[PDB]
């Protein structure tokens, strides 16, 4: 008997699902995947439900100011998003203290601009919580109501909970390999060497993107084996693979990303106006994605701004991870020109076909330069043979205008000729995540 309460408004997309009145009471049965079967209270008939729309009644997951799952870094991004105000806040699980909590509050000063301050919410041994010992509370709800009435030592008085959008409905049960007929291709987004990309509708109810691979470009079995690894690479900064059509021409089905590639974005009216701290935040988002790929012993093989996608809310998501591996070299793909771009590719990958996480690190440094130049071609003024020979003699792209020296230093580290000398994405992540907050403490010590 596990009791669970609803949270959002959702009607059955399928024919087996129930209703959500933004408030209800349910009791879960089986807990496989992201769809759960639950015994509900309207009234004595049930079915399957999306797990991300519900929560246990005991935990704080029901509270509007609590954000389960998210990181410190993501708390900051969420809060600094447009639509939030001074003293906007959230409570989340602590990162550096298991079982305890953290308060994140949107702040402002003329000297540092918009910032997010973090406070340790310590738990008392016999029940209750405090930030400062002189002010303890039975519940986190009491803590919140307290600091809503006055800052009492915090940077700001709490105003309203961090805004949040209703999450993506989880993908249909056991719909990994789907029929081609289940997709309606509505708008061609782009045409490339080995396939096209379409905006499309799945089963007349869900917006997706579909990459349609050219006949001759991939083998069904080799692709499916690889895709079965790709789908498990689940992370906020990787684009999500929903499903595949396992019949030539092979279709790849993913979440749709409203702002297209980061390269397109940086070259748009809107993206060309992003300020440098936002550019650095894109870099950090990609580094986080790559550190996950690195921790999972996977290889991207074609990391560049063109293969980064951008959401409506400016989340960067890595796409085409691993795809280059299963694009075949034959008479068909050959008449399409270069398989990989020389200017983005590590020298050992070019010279010997040695693709590793370390050649991805090389590509990342190039991507960094693409970002800070808003999508300029690498090595301007140079041919491909000229780039290769210059690189062999220690030439590296010089630092451009409007590039912080520490960002350049990171690029130069990525561009070591010997791969073992290049940093880890775990390192790159940490430096970029803390780029502007290096000489600052994690949490504020409130008297």
Ligand X SMILES: CC(C)C[C@H](N[C@H]1CC[C@H](n2cc(-c3ccc(Oc4ccccc4)cc3)c3c(N)ncnc32)CC1)C(N)=O
Closest CA to 105 of 121, 86, 132: 86
Instruction: Identify which of residues 106 and 301 has a Cβ nearer to ligand X in the complex.
Output: 301
Report residue 118 as tokens.
């973090």
Report residue 123 as tokens.
């738990």
Q: How far is the CB of 8 from ligand X (least distance, A)?
A: 24
- Active-site entry in 302, 320, 360, 433: 302
Closest CA to 326 of 217, 403, 418: 217
Of 209, 279, 303, 403, the one binding ligand X (CB under 6 A) is 209
195 binds ligand X (CB under 6 A): no
User: Strand order in 113-123's β-sheet?
Assistant: 89-93, 101-109, 113-123, 129-130, 136-137
Three-state SS for 325? helix
168 is in an annotated binding site: no
Whether 302 is catalytic is yes
Instruction: Identify which of residues 83 and 337 has a Cβ nearer to ligand X in the complex.
Output: 337
Q: How far is the CB of 316 from ligand X (least distance, A)?
A: 13
| CA distances (Å), origin 122, targets 143, 222, 223 | 11, 51, 49
212 binds ligand X (CB under 6 A): no
E strands, 82-135, in order: 89-93, 101-109, 113-123, 129-130
Instruction: Identify which of residues 144 and 209 has a Cβ nearer to ligand X in the complex.
Output: 209
Q: How far is the CB of 48 from ligand X (least distance, A)?
A: 27
Query: How far apart, in whole angstroms, are the C-alpha atoms of residue 376 and residue 366?
Result: 11
CA atoms within 13 A on the CB side of 355: 16
140 binds ligand X (CB under 6 A): no
Q: How far is the CB of 429 from ligand X (least distance, A)?
A: 20
Instruction: Identify which of residues 147 and 298 has a Cβ nearer to ligand X in the complex.
Output: 298
360 binds ligand X (CB under 6 A): no
320 binds ligand X (CB under 6 A): yes
> Which residues are the active-site residues?
302
Catalog residues that contact ligand X under the rule CB under 6 A: 189-190, 197, 209, 211, 230, 239, 241, 252, 254, 256-257, 260-261, 264, 309, 319-321, 323
């Amino acid at each position: 008997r596990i009791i669970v309460v609803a949270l959002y408004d959702y009607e059955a997309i399928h024919h087996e699902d129930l209703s959500f009145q933004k408030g209800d009471q349910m009791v879960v049965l089986e807990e496989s995947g992201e769809w759960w079967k639950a015994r509900s209270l309207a009234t004595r008939k049930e079915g399957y439900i999306p797990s991300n729309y519900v929560a246990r009644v005991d935990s704080l997951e029901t509270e509007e100011w609590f954000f389960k799952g998210i990181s410190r870094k993501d708390a900051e991004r969420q809060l600094l998003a447009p639509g939030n105000m001074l003293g906007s806040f959230m409570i989340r699980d602590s990162e550096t203290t298991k079982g305890s909590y953290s308060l994140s509050v949107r702040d402002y000063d003329p000297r540092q601009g918009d910032t997010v301050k973090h406070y340790k919410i310590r738990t008392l041994d016999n029940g209750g919580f405090y930030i400062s010992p002189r002010s303890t509370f039975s519940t986190l709800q009491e803590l919140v109501d307290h600091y809503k009435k006055g800052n009492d030592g915090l940077c700001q008085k709490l105003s309203v909970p961090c805004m949040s959008s209703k999450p993506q409905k989880p993908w249909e049960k056991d719909a990994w390999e789907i029929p081609r007929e289940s997709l309606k291709l509505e708008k061609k987004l782009g045409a490339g060497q080995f396939g096209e990309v379409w905006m499309a509708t799945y089963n007349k109810h869900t917006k997706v993107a579909v990459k349609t691979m050219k006949p001759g470009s991939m083998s069904v079995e080799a692709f499916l084996a690889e895709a079965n690894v790709m789908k498990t690479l689940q992370h906020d900064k990787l684009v999500k693979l929903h499903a595949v059509v396992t019949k030539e021409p092979i279709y790849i089905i993913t979440e749709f990303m409203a702002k297209g590639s980061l390269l397109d974005f940086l070259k748009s009216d809107e993206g060309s106006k992003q300020p440098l701290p936002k550019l650095i935040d894109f870099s950090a988002q990609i580094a986080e994605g790559m550190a996950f790929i690195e921790q999972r012993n996977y290889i991207h093989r074609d990391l560049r701004a063109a293969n980064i996608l951008v959401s409506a809310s400016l989340v960067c998501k890595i796409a085409d991870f691993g795809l280059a591996r299963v694009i075949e070299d034959n008479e068909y793909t050959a008449r399409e020109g270069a398989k990989f771009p020389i200017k983005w590719t590590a020298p050992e990958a070019i010279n010997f076909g040695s693709f590793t996480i370390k050649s991805d690190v090389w590509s990342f440094g190039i991507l960094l330069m693409e970002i800070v130049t808003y999508g300029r071609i690498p090595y301007p003024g140079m041919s491909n043979p000229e780039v290769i020979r210059a690189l062999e003699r220690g030439y590296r792209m010089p630092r451009p205008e409007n590039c912080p020296e520490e960002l350049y230093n990171i690029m130069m580290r990525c561009w070591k000729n010997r791969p073992e000398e290049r940093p880890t994405f775990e390192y790159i992540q940490s430096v970029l995540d803390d780029f502007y907050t290096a000489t600052e403490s994690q949490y504020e010590e409130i008297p």
